[PDB]
C-alpha cells in the first residue's frame, strides 16, 4: 500500500519497462552460474583427456588423435560459450541500467513537480509550524535518496537473487550432499562473523568509555583554559591525560588482538571448510567416481552466490531506507490537505467592491496556547472611506489586515466583504481584489518590469509607465540606466528603500484592486522619502476602499474614520475631532507621545617521515606481512596443482598426490596464516597504539603550552578541538594500518604473481595483461564519468534548488498568489534540463556498465580461447591455465584491497596535515627568566596609564581606550561600569591573557609587558562568575599546585576555615576526600564559589581579583560569601568589579569607568557628593 505502491506510483509504461528490465536482471544473474556451469563442462572433457594422456607410456600418436579431437570439440563449444553469454549479458546489462535511469527520471520528475506544487499549496501551514527551510532541505535530501531507492539497486538485487536461488538450484540438482556440507559451514561462517559483531560493538564502547575520561579531561580543561593558565596547573593535567591515554591504548591493543583472532579464525574456517569440500569431493572421485570436479568448483561458485547475497543486502537497505523515509513524509509530500485556501472554484463576485464589514470576530494566532490577540471585533467601514487603526503594545491591528486576506480562518464570527461572507468567494479572485502594501518591501531578483509583471501576468510597458508615473516612481528609474530592464541584483538591497516600497506600490497599482491594504508602509522610513511615498499612497488612496494601519499620525489626520485598539482590543471609533473630544486612548497616545574545519593545505609525504620519527622499530610486522603476502598465492598454486594433476595424470598415484596436496593446503594455510596474521596484527596494532599515544600527547601539550588568541579569543570551539584529538590520531592510525595492508598485498600480487607469470609461454602473459589493465582503466574512467555526471547534476539541481529555496523562504508571495503557478512554471522549465540530462545519463550509465561486463566475457574468452587453440596445438599442459586464475584472484585482491584503503589514505593525509601544522605551534612563553627573582620584589601597587585594548576581534569597539588607574597596597580597589566588558577585561589584562595595543601596565612599577608570564600568574586572586570545578577530590580541587606546592592538609584546613566551606567539610562521609560527584552535581553556586575562594586564598596572593562573584546567588549565600570575600581581602590588594552596589559601599577607592575612559574616581561619599553615572547607578539600584 502506502509503503510500496505510492513509492512506485504512476509510470504506466514506466512500470512496464520496469518489469522488462527486472526480467533482464533475472536472466543476467542466471547467466553467471551458467557461465560457471560451462566451466565444469570444459573441465570435465579436459579432465578425461588428461587422464589418458599420462596413462600412456606406450602410445603417443593416439593421444595426439583423440585428446585433440575432444579439445577441438571443446574449443568449438568455447566459441559458442563466451559469445553466447557475452551478447546476452551485454544487452541485459544495458537494459538493467536503463532501469536505473529511464524509470527513475520520470518518477523523480513527477515527484518533484508534485512536491514543489503541494508545498506552495499548503499555504498557511508552513508559517504555522515546522522548520520552513530545514524541512525543505532534508526533504530534498530524501527525494535524493529516492534515486538510490528506485534505481538499478533493485535490478542488482534481483540479479543477486538469480545467482543465489538459481545457483543453489543447480547445486542441489547435481548433488544433495556437498550442498549439506556447505549448508553446514554456512552457520559456521556465520558463527565466526557473529564473534566479530560482538567484539567490535563491545570493544568500541570500552575505548569510548576510556577516551570519555580523556575526553572529559579534555572537555573541562579546554573550558577551564583561562583558569588552569592562571593557576599554572598545566603539568598535572599533562600527566593525567597521559595516564588516561595509557589506558585507552591498552584497550586499543586488546581490541586489535581480538580482532586479528576473529578475522584469522574466520578465514581458517573458510579454507578448512573449502578443503573439506575437496577432500570429500575427491573421495567421491577416486574410489567412488561420481563428480569429475565440475560441481566441486561450481559449489564454490555457490559461495560466490552467497557473496552475491552479501552484495544484495545493501541494495535492500538502499531501498528500505529510501522507502521508509519517503512514504512517511509522502503523506505530507503529496495531495492537498489544504481546506482553508486551495486554488480553485468557489464563487466569483462581479460586484467588484463591497463595504467592508467586521462582525464579532474572535481569533487566536496558531501559536496555540498563546492568548487570543484579538478578542471580539466590531468594525464597519462604509465604501470609499479610509479607516485608520492604531495601537500601542503592538500588532492587533495587523491581525485584522491579516484576516481580511483570509490568511487565517477566524475562530468565531465572520468577516463580510460586500454582503457575503468572505469564505464563499473564490480565494484566488479574492487575492486579486486585495492589494497589500507591507511596511518592509521585498523585490524578487528580476527587472523592475518583471517585478511589476509579477503583479499582473498580462501587461504592456505602457501600463507599467502609467503605474509608476501615477506612483511618481518614474523619476529615479529613468535617470537610472537600463531603465525598466534594470535588474535588482543580489536579492533586494541595491537602491533606496523608499524607492523599493514605491515600486511595490506601482506593482499593487497595476493589480487595480478594489480593496487596498496598507500596513505601516510609511513606518520604518526616512522622513523625506516618507513624504514622497506618502504622497504616492495618497494618490493611491481616496480611489479605493482601503484600510490603513500605521503608527504615523500625520497621515491619520486626513483619515475619514479612526479606530483605537492597543493590543487588538477595540474601544473607540470615529473622526479625529470627535476622538480628541473624547480625550481617550487616541488622544492619550497622540499627545503623550506628542561548526566545520579542515583548511586545504596538505601533508606531502611528511606523514611517513614524522611517523617513522615517532615509530622507533617495526620490521617484523611488515616482513611478516611479506611472508603472508607470498603465502596467499601458494593456496592458488596448490589448488591449481590439485586439479592440475587431477586433470592430467593417470589412475595410479592419484590418492597420494591428492592427499598430499590436501594436507599441504591445510598446513600451509590454516596453520601458518593464523600465525602470521596474528603476529602482524600484534605488531602494527601496538604500532598504531603507541602512535595514538605519542601523537595525542605531543598535540595536547602543544595545545596547552600555547594560548595567545587560540584560547583567549579563538574563532574555534571546544568541540572542534576534542574532534581534532579524536579524528586526527584515528585517521593516521588507519594510515599506518593501510601502509602494512598495502605492502602486504603489493608483494602478494606483484611479487609472487610475477614469479608465477614468468613460467608462462610469455604470450599468455601479454594477452592476460592486455585484459586486466584495460578493464581496470575502463573501470576508472567509468568512475570518473560517474562522478562528473553526478556533479553536473548536482550543479543543475543546485540552481533549481536555489530559486526554490528563494521561493519557499519568501512566504509573502502568497499575498499576491499571482506567482503560485508562475513559480512552478519556472521550476518546471528549470527541471526540464536535468530531465533531458536524466535521459542523457540513461545512455551514459547504460554503456559503461554494459562495457564493463562486455570485458568480462571477453576476459574469459581470450583466457580459455588462447588457452585452447594454439596452446592445444603443441605441448598442451595442465599448468599455466589455473595460474591464470591465480593471477586473476590476485588482481581481484589488488583492486579490492587497494581501492578499499584508498580513501582511508586520503582523509588521513588531510587529518595528518592538520595535526602537523598545529604541533609546530608558536611556543612563545613557558619558563625562561627575564628576571632573577630578587628577594626585594613585593608591594602590589598596580599602575595603569593610557592603556587601550581590544580582544582579538580587531574592530570590535575596543573596550579599553585611554585608560589609567592606580591602586595602593593592602586596600580594596572597587570597579563599576555599564555592562558587558571593561569590567572583566581589566582583570583579564592583569592575567596578561592578551597584551594591549598601546600603553603600559605595572605591578611593582616594573613593566608587566616585560615581566615573566609565570610568576605574574603565580600571585592572583581570580574568581569568575560561575567557577568551574574539575572532577577530582574536593581536597585536590581546593589545592591546585601553583608550582612545587604539595597538597597540604593544614593549609586547606585554613582555607576552609576562612572560606566558610568548612561546614560541609566537618560532616558527611569521606569529608575532604569526597569526590565532586560527576561534575559537581551536588553543589549549588554558593558552595562552588566558596571552594573557588578557598582556591584563591590558598595561594596567599598579594593580589585578589573578583569578577562578579556574587552576580548569581541569593539569601544567606550572598552574605556568607560576601563575608568570606571581605575576610579574604583587607590583608592584601584586591580588585572588585562586582555588580552589587549594595556591597560596594565598603571600598577604599571606587572608580567610575565610562567605556574605556575612566570618568570619575574616589571614595563613596566623595562621588556621592559628585553627580553623574555613579549616582544614577545607585538611584536605579533602588
Amino acid at each position: 500500500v502506502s509503503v510500496l505502491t505510492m513509492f512506485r506510483y504512476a509510470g504506466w509504461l514506466d512500470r512496464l519497462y520496469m518489469l522488462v528490465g527486472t526480467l533482464a536482471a533475472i536472466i543476467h544473474g542466471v547467466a553467471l552460474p551458467l557461465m560457471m556451469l560451462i566451466f565444469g563442462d570444459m573441465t570435465d572433457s579436459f579432465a578425461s583427456v588428461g587422464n589418458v594422456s599420462k596413462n600412456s607410456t606406450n602410445m603417443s600418436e593416439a593421444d595426439k588423435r583423440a585428446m585433440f579431437a575432444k579439445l577441438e570439440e571443446e574449443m568449438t563449444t568455447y566459441a559458442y560459450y563466451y559469445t553466447g553469454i557475452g551478447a546476452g549479458v551485454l544487452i541485459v546489462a544495458y537494459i538493467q541500467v536503463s532501469f536505473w535511469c529511464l524509470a527513475a527520471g520520470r518518477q523523480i520528475h513527477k515527484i518533484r513537480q508534485k512536491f514543489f506544487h503541494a508545498i506552495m499549496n499548503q499555504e498557511i501551514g508552513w508559517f504555522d509550524v515546522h522548520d520552513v527551510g530545514e524541512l525543505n532541505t532534508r526533504l530534498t535530501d530524501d527525494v535524493s535518496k529516492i534515486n538510490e531507492g528506485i534505481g538499478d539497486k533493485i535490478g542488482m538485487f534481483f540479479q543477486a537473487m538469480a545467482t543465489f536461488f538459481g545457483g543453489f538450484i543447480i547445486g542441489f540438482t547435481r548433488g544433495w550432499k556437498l550442498t549439506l556440507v556447505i549448508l553446514a559451514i554456512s552457520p559456521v561462517l556465520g558463527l565466526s562473523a557473529g564473534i566479530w559483531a560482538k567484539i567490535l560493538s563491545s570493544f568500541t564502547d570500552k575505548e569510548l568509555h576510556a577516551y570519555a575520561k580523556a575526553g572529559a579531561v579534555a572537555e573541562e580543561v579546554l573550558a577551564a583554559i583561562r583558569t588552569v593558565i592562571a593557576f599554572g596547573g598545566q603539568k598535572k593535567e599533562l600527566e593525567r591525560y597521559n595516564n588516561n591515554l595509557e589506558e585507552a591504548k591498552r584497550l586499543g591493543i586488546k581490541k586489535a588482538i581480538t580482532a586479528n583472532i576473529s578475522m584469522g579464525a574466520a578465514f581458517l574456517l573458510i579454507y578448512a571448510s573449502y578443503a573439506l569440500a575437496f577432500w570429500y569431493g575427491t573421495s567421491l572421485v577416486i574410489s567412488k567416481e561420481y563428480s569429475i570436479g565440475q560441481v566441486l568448483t561450481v559449489f564454490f561458485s555457490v559461495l560466490i552466490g552467497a557473496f552475491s547475497v552479501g552484495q544484495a543486502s545493501p541494495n535492500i537497505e538502499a531501498f528500505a531506507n529510501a522507502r521508509g523515509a519517503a512514504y512517511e513524509v509522502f503523506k505530507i509530500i503529496d495531495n492537498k490537505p489544504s481546506i482553508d485556501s486551495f486554488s480553485k472554484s468557489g464563487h466569483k463576485p462581479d460586484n467588484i467592491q463591497g463595504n467592508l464589514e467586521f462582525k464579532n470576530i474572535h481569533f487566536s494566532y496558531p501559536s496555540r496556547k498563546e492568548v487570543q490577540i484579538l478578542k471580539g471585533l466590531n468594525l464597519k467601514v462604509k465604501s470609499g472611506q479610509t479607516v485608520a487603526l492604531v495601537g500601542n503594545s503592538g500588532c492587533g491591528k495587523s491581525t485584522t489586515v491579516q484576516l481580511m486576506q483570509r490568511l487565517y480562518d477566524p475562530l468565531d464570527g465572520m468577516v463580510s466583504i460586500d454582503g457575503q461572507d468572505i469564505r464563499t468567494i473564490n480565494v484566488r479572485y479574492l487575492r486579486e481584489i486585495i492589494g497589500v502594501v507591507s511596511q518592509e518591501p521585498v523585490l524578487f531578483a528580476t527587472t523592475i518590469a518583471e517585478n511589476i509583471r509579477y503583479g499582473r501576468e498580462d501587461v504592456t510597458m505602457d501600463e507599467i509607465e502609467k503605474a509608476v508615473k501615477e506612483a511618481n516612481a518614474y523619476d529615479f528609474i529613468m535617470k537610472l540606466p537600463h531603465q525598466f530592464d534594470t535588474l535588482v541584483g543580489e536579492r533586494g538591497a541595491q537602491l533606496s528603500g523608499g524607492q523599493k516600497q514605491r515600486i511595490a506600490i506601482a506593482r499593487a497599482l497595476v493589480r487595480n484592486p478594489k480593496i487596498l491594504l496598507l500596513d505601516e508602509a510609511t513606518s520604518a522610513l526616512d522622513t523625506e522619502s516618507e513624504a514622497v511615498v506618502q504622497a504616492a499612497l495618497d494618490k493611491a488612496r481616496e480611489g479605493r476602499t482601503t484600510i490603513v494601519i500605521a503608527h504615523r499620525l500625520s497621515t491619520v489626520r486626513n483619515a475619514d474614520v479612526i479606530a483605537g485598539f492597543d493590543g487588538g482590543v477595540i474601544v473607540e471609533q470615529g473622526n479625529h475631532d470627535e476622538l480628541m473630544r473624547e480625550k481617550g486612548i487616541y488622544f492619550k497616545l497622540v499627545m503623550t507621545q506628542t561548526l566545520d574545519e579542515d583548511v586545504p593545505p596538505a601533508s606531502f609525504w611528511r606523514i611517513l617521515k614524522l611517523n617513522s620519527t615517532e615509530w622507533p622499530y617495526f620490521v617484523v610486522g611488515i616482513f611478516c606481512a611479506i611472508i603472508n603476502g607470498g603465502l596467499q598465492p601458494a593456496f592458488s598454486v596448490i589448488f591449481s596443482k590439485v586439479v592440475g594433476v587431477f586433470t592430467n595424470g593417470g589412475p595410479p598415484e592419484t590418492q597420494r598426490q591428492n592427499s598430499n596436496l590436501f594436507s599441504l593446503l591445510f598446513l600451509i594455510l590454516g596453520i601458518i596464516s593464523f600465525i602470521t596474521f596474528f603476529l602482524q596484527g600484534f605488531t602494527f596494532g601496538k604500532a598504531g597504539e603507541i602512535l595514538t599515544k605519542r601523537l595525542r600527547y605531543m598535540v595536547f601539550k602543544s595545545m596547552l603550552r600555547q594560548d595567545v588568541s587560540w584560547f583567549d579569543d579563538p574563532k574555534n570551539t571546544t568541540g572542534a578541538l576534542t574532534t581534532r584529538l579524536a579524528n586526527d590520531a584515528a585517521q593516521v592510525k588507519g594510515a599506518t594500518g593501510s601502509r602494512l595492508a598495502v605492502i602486504f598485498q603489493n608483494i602478494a600480487n606483484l611479487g609472487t604473481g610475477i614469479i608465477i607469470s614468468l613460467i608462462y609461454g610469455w604470450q599468455l602473459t601479454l594477452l592476460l595483461l592486455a585484459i586486466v589493465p584495460i578493464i581496470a582503466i575502463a573501470g576508472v574512467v567509468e568512475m570518473k564519468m560517474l562522478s562528473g555526471q553526478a556533479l553536473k547534476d548536482k550543479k543543475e539541481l543546485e540552481g533549481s534548488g536555489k530559486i526554490a529555496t528563494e521561493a519557499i523562504e519568501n512566504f509573502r508571495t502568497v499575498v499576491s498568489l499571482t506567482r503560485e503557478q508562475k513559480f512552478e512554471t519556472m521550476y518546471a522549465q528549470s527541471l526540464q534540463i536535468p530531465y533531458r540530462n536524466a535521459m542523457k545519463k540513461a545512455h551514459v550509465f547504460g554503456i559503461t556498465f554494459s562495457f564493463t561486463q562486455a570485458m568480462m566475457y571477453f576476459s574469459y574468452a581470450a583466457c580459455f580461447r588462447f588457452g585452447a587453440y594454439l596452446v592445444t596445438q603443441q605441448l598442451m599442459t595442465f599448468e599455466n591455465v589455473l595460474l591464470v586464475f591465480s593471477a586473476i584472484v590476485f588482481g581481484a585482491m589488488a583492486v579490492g584491497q587497494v581501492s578499499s584503503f584508498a580513501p582511508d589514505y586520503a582523509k588521513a593525509t588531510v587529518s595528518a596535515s592538520h595535526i602537523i601544522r598545529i604541533i609546530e605551534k608558536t611556543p612563545e612563553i613557558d619558563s625562561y627568566s627575564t628576571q632573577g627573582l630578587k628577594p626585594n620584589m613585593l608591594e602590589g601597587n598596580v599602575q595603569f596609564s593610557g592603556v587601550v585594548f581590544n580582544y582579538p576581534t580587531r574592530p570590535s569597539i575596543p573596550v579599553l581606550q585611554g585608560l589609567s588607574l592606580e591602586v595602593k597596597k593592602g586596600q580594596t580597589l572597587a570597579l563599576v561600569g555599564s555592562s558587558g566588558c571593561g569590567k572583566s577585561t581589566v582583570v583579564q589584562l592583569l592575567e596578561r591573557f592578551y597584551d594591549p595595543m598601546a600603553g603600559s601596565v605595572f605591578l611593582d612599577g616594573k613593566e608587566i609587558k616585560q615581566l615573566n608570564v609565570q610568576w605574574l600568574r603565580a600571585q592572583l586572586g581570580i574568581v569568575s562568575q560561575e567557577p568551574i570545578l574539575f572532577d577530582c577530590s574536593i581536597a585536590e580541587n581546593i589545592a591546585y599546585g601553583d608550582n612545587s606546592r604539595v597538597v597540604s592538609y593544614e593549609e586547606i584546613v585554613r582555607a576552609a576555615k576562612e572560606a566558610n566551606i568548612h561546614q560541609f567539610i566537618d560532616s558527611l562521609p569521606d569529608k575532604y576526600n569526597t569526590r565532586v560527584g560527576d561534575k559537581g552535581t551536588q553543589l549549588s553556586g554558593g558552595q562552588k564559589q566558596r571552594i573557588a575562594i578557598a582556591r584563591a586564598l590558598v595561594r596567599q596572593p598579594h593580589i585578589l581579583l573578583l569578577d562578579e562573584a556574587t552576580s548569581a546567588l541569593d539569601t544567606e549565600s550572598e552574605k556568607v560569601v560576601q563575608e568570606a570575600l571581605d575576610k579574604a581581602r583587607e590583608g592584601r590588594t584586591c580588585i572588585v568589579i562586582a555588580h552589587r552596589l549594595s556591597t560596594i559601599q565598603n571600598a577604599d577607592l571606587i572608580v567610575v569607568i565610562q567605556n574605556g575612559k575612566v570618568k570619575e574616581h574616589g571614595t563613596h561619599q566623595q562621588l556621592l557628593a559628585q553627580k553623574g553615572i555613579y549616582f544614577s547607578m545607585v538611584s536605579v539600584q533602588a
Epitope: 522622513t527 516618507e530 503608527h551 504615523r552 499620525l553 500625520s554 489626520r557 497616545l589 507621545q593 506628542t594
Partner: nanobody, 118 residues
C-alpha cells in the same frame, strides 16, 4: 536636518516669571508641533507643554498646568512659553522637542538648564 534651540533659559527665584521660546528650523509640514521638556538628574524625563501645529489647542502637564502659558511666532515657526510662578521643584534641564508623524519623540534640540530657589 532638524534642531530646536531655546531662548531665555536662566535663573530666577520662587514667584518670578521666566518667559522662554523654542526656535524650530528645518523641513516638515504635516503635523510637526513644538513641545517642551524637563528632566532632573537621578530621575526620568518628564514633559511640559505642547501646542498642536494643526489649529486646535495646547497640552499642559498635571504639574505645570494653570501656571505656564505658550504661544507662537504667528508669522514663522517658534513657541513662546511664559513660565509664571516657578517653584524650587521646577529646577531642571528644559529641552524643547518637535513632533513626529509616528508620534514618538524622534526630534530633539539644545535644551537649557533652569535653577529655582525661594
Amino acid at each position: 536636518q532638524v534642531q530646536l534651540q531655546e531662548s531665555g533659559g536662566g535663573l530666577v527665584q520662587a514667584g518670578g516669571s521666566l518667559r522662554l521660546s523654542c526656535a524650530a528650523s528645518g523641513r516638515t509640514f504635516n503635523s510637526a508641533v513644538m513641545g517642551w521638556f524637563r528632566q532632573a538628574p537621578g530621575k526620568e524625563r518628564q514633559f511640559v507643554a505642547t501646542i498642536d501645529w494643526s489649529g486646535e489647542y495646547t497640552y499642559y502637564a498635571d504639574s505645570v498646568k494653570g501656571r505656564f502659558t505658550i504661544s507662537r511666532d504667528n508669522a514663522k515657526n517658534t513657541v513662546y512659553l511664559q513660565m509664571t510662578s516657578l517653584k524650587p521643584e521646577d529646577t531642571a534641564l528644559y529641552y524643547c522637542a518637535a513632533r513626529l508623524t509616528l508620534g514618538q519623540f524622534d526630534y530633539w534640540g539644545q535644551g537649557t538648564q533652569v535653577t529655582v530657589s525661594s
